[PDB]
Structure formats: structure tokens, C-alpha cells
Amino acid sequence: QTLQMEIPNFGNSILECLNEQRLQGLYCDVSVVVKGHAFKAHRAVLAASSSYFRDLFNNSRSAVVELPAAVQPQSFQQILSFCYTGRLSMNVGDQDLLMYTAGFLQIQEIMEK
Amino acid sequence: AQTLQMEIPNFGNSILECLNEQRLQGLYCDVSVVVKGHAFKAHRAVLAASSSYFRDLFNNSRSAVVELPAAVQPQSFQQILSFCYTGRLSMNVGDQDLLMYTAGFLQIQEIMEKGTEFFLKV
């Protein structure tokens, strides 16, 4: 006799809270610095969507990581937001940079087919 | 915050599932919660999203290891931890009282409120 409970779309709700947390700088365990702009985040969430961060966080315990000159802050901001929401916004004029950065950071689900 | 170029449905559902797998392998975890000498790796963020007790505990401390009081049992805790990462709670008839007590202690408010509830599994 098993008793069972199941909350529908639980992950959807939890990731929203994690995004709120990040937006308010709560329970973050890494700071990612891009051209002198610091973004707080959770390693776990970055790792879930990026094989680049997966490999980096597998191999380094530093509290801050700085990305190379490739990555620009606006682009990174969009990618970060994607990792917490599954939404990627449109970028008029810098779609090439955004795509380059997504590829660089090996964001696996951002491109299709 | 205008035009999206992509939107993955049910993204959070899949990501939390990834987070659960990471925990089960000890990856990218930032806290170790110890219960009657049994240590559990976790992510503070995932605990805090579901547990008012943990939110509090993490703000009144600066420590990678947390020890829960002796009133909290390991098997029950494991069930609560899994729930925080899945939204599913499972257990045997005969263990519901202990699980409910543990959920109360850790102030998992999704567990004891209106909405979905426990059932007998098929």
C-alpha cells in the first residue's frame, strides 16, 4: 500500500523561483564576470543548460569566473536568462554575437534540428 | 522583453529533473545536510524554494554543512529531499505520520495545503 502525491508542472514553478532568487541575488554560488560586469548565478542551473559550464564547474571551484573577450555582457545576459526560463529574446543588430556566444558556451537546446 | 526567438515549453520540468540527477551524483551541490550522521548533498536554492525552515537556516549561517536536530529522521528526510526535486512524494502506509511530521518540521508548505493531495498508488 503506497501513498503517492504528485504536483503537476512542479519543475516549471521551481525554476521560476530559482530565477527570482537569482534576480534578487539569493543563494547564488558563482559570479560570472563579463567585460567588468558581474552576474550572480547558480552553477547547477548553468551546468544544466551548458556543457561549457558543466566542464568548467567540474574543474574549478573559484567563486568568480571571467569569460573571454568573445562573450559580451548584453549577450550573456540573454543567455543567462534563457538558462533560467527557456525563453531566448530577439536581438536586433546583435543576433550574430548572441548566436556566437550561445555556441561558445555550448548551450545545447538553443539551436534546433 | 519584446519578441522571443524561442520558448521551450515545460523547460523548468526538464531542468529540475537535471538538477535532481546532479544531486544524485553529488554535482554542483553547495550544501551537505546531515541527519543522524547520514550526509546528503543538495543545492541550497532548491531547498529554499520549498522549505521555509531551510531558507531561514541558510540566512543565519555561513557553512557548507548543516546538521538537523535529532527529531528529524533520515528516511523521512530523504523522502522530503526527493520531493523538493521532483514534486512527487511517495511512502508506505505505516510511514505517513513520520513523513507529515518531517514535512512540518521543514515547513514544506506545498505538502499540507489545499490543492492536490495523497492517494493510494495503483
Curated annotation (Swiss-Prot), chain A:
Encoding gene, per UniProt annotation: NACC1
Distribution of this protein across tissues and organs: Overexpressed in several types of carcinomas including ovarian serous carcinomas. Expression levels positively correlate with tumor recurrence in ovarian serous carcinomas, and intense immunoreactivity in primary ovarian tumors predicts early recurrence. Up-regulated in ovarian carcinomas after chemotherapy, suggesting a role in development of chemotherapy resistance in ovarian cancer.
Predominant location category: nucleus
Protein name stated in the entry: Nucleus accumbens-associated protein 1
Domain BTB intervals: 28-92
Disease per record: Neurodevelopmental disorder with epilepsy, cataracts, feeding difficulties, and delayed brain myelination: A neurodevelopmental disorder characterized by microcephaly, profound developmental delay, intellectual disability, cataracts, severe epilepsy including infantile spasms, irritability, failure to thrive, and stereotypic hand movements. Brain imaging reveals delayed myelination and cerebral atrophy.
Keyword Transcription (UniProt): yes
Cellular component, GO annotation: cell junction; cytoplasm; intracellular membrane-bounded organelle; nucleoplasm; nucleus
Molecular function in Gene Ontology: DNA-binding transcription factor activity, RNA polymerase II-specific; DNA-binding transcription repressor activity, RNA polymerase II-specific; histone deacetylase binding; RNA polymerase II cis-regulatory region sequence-specific DNA binding
Annotated source species: Homo sapiens (Human)
UniProtKB/Swiss-Prot annotation, chain B:
Localization in the cell: Nucleus; Cytoplasm
Residue span(s) of domain BTB: 29-93
Tissue specificity field: Overexpressed in several types of carcinomas including ovarian serous carcinomas. Expression levels positively correlate with tumor recurrence in ovarian serous carcinomas, and intense immunoreactivity in primary ovarian tumors predicts early recurrence. Up-regulated in ovarian carcinomas after chemotherapy, suggesting a role in development of chemotherapy resistance in ovarian cancer.
Superkingdom to which the source organism belongs: Eukaryota
Pathology noted in the entry: Neurodevelopmental disorder with epilepsy, cataracts, feeding difficulties, and delayed brain myelination: A neurodevelopmental disorder characterized by microcephaly, profound developmental delay, intellectual disability, cataracts, severe epilepsy including infantile spasms, irritability, failure to thrive, and stereotypic hand movements. Brain imaging reveals delayed myelination and cerebral atrophy.
Quaternary structure, from the entry: Homooligomer; mediated by the BTB domain. Interacts with HDAC3 and HDAC4. Interacts (via BTB domain) with CUL3, PSMD7 and RCOR1.
Task of the protein: Functions as a transcriptional repressor. Seems to function as a transcriptional corepressor in neuronal cells through recruitment of HDAC3 and HDAC4. Contributes to tumor progression, and tumor cell proliferation and survival. This may be mediated at least in part through repressing transcriptional activity of GADD45GIP1. Required for recruiting the proteasome from the nucleus to the cytoplasm and dendritic spines.
Protein name: Nucleus accumbens-associated protein 1
